[PDB]
Amino acid sequence: MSGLKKFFPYSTNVLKGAAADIALPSLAGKTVFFYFSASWCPPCRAFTPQLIDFYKAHAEKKNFEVMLISWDESAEDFKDYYAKMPWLALPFEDRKGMEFLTTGFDVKSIPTLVGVEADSGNIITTQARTMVVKDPEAKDFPWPNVEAK
């Protein structure tokens, strides 16, 4: 699963609600979305509920997962914000890992939603945020290269 691991030089497991036991290899075959967000961001607050709806409707059928990559500035804020989400999270303690992803994808502002292929480790798009609201039925999911629009 070397492809997906390329995104996590400093973590082998990610959070899942109570358990911090999800092992990366368990995402094999899925599309994985990195969600760059934070509690102090007004548009994230407005966008998150929409992503949560999308996730409840298609995560299973469309076979995808989402992972919070937090820009929160404290462990406590992180803890509370992520508590309100149903998906995965890169642990707050892996700050360098957050920074590696943030620069890697050139994430200048949030919310940003980046779509990736678990198996090959390839990138689908860094602009899935707008497609989540623009295509709620997920007809064109996972939207490769929306950057062309």
Place this chain on the structure above:
Amino acid sequence: MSGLKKFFPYSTNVLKGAAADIALPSLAGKTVFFYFSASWCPPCRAFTPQLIDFYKAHAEKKNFEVMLISWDESAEDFKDYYAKMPWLALPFEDRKGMEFLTTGFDVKSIPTLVGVEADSGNIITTQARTMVVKDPEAKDFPWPNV
């Protein structure tokens, strides 16, 4: 180059550094690798330098060329991103062209690297992206698998 010419329905000439006047007849008899990439892509950023070493070491002897087909989101990004590459590029302004090629090669994510025989327009290899790192010397070039 009737065949190859069909891969470019909207562009007569491609880029080559500052030179925007390279014509497709150049690519005759050789293998042409269509490299689907963008500055926003980490795996691309890690593969590009490998492909650059590979290009500079075998483009002449193994007789092939590489052409960037950009998934960048802006002309400014394209400019700085392409400046660092030695090979060719479909001009950014031809968005319709990169969409044609994307659909044609069915590119669903990047990086994607596809080798095609310039003379028949047949896809020679589908695994050059993998084999470029595993066969840095070019022993099994061009890793036919179609």
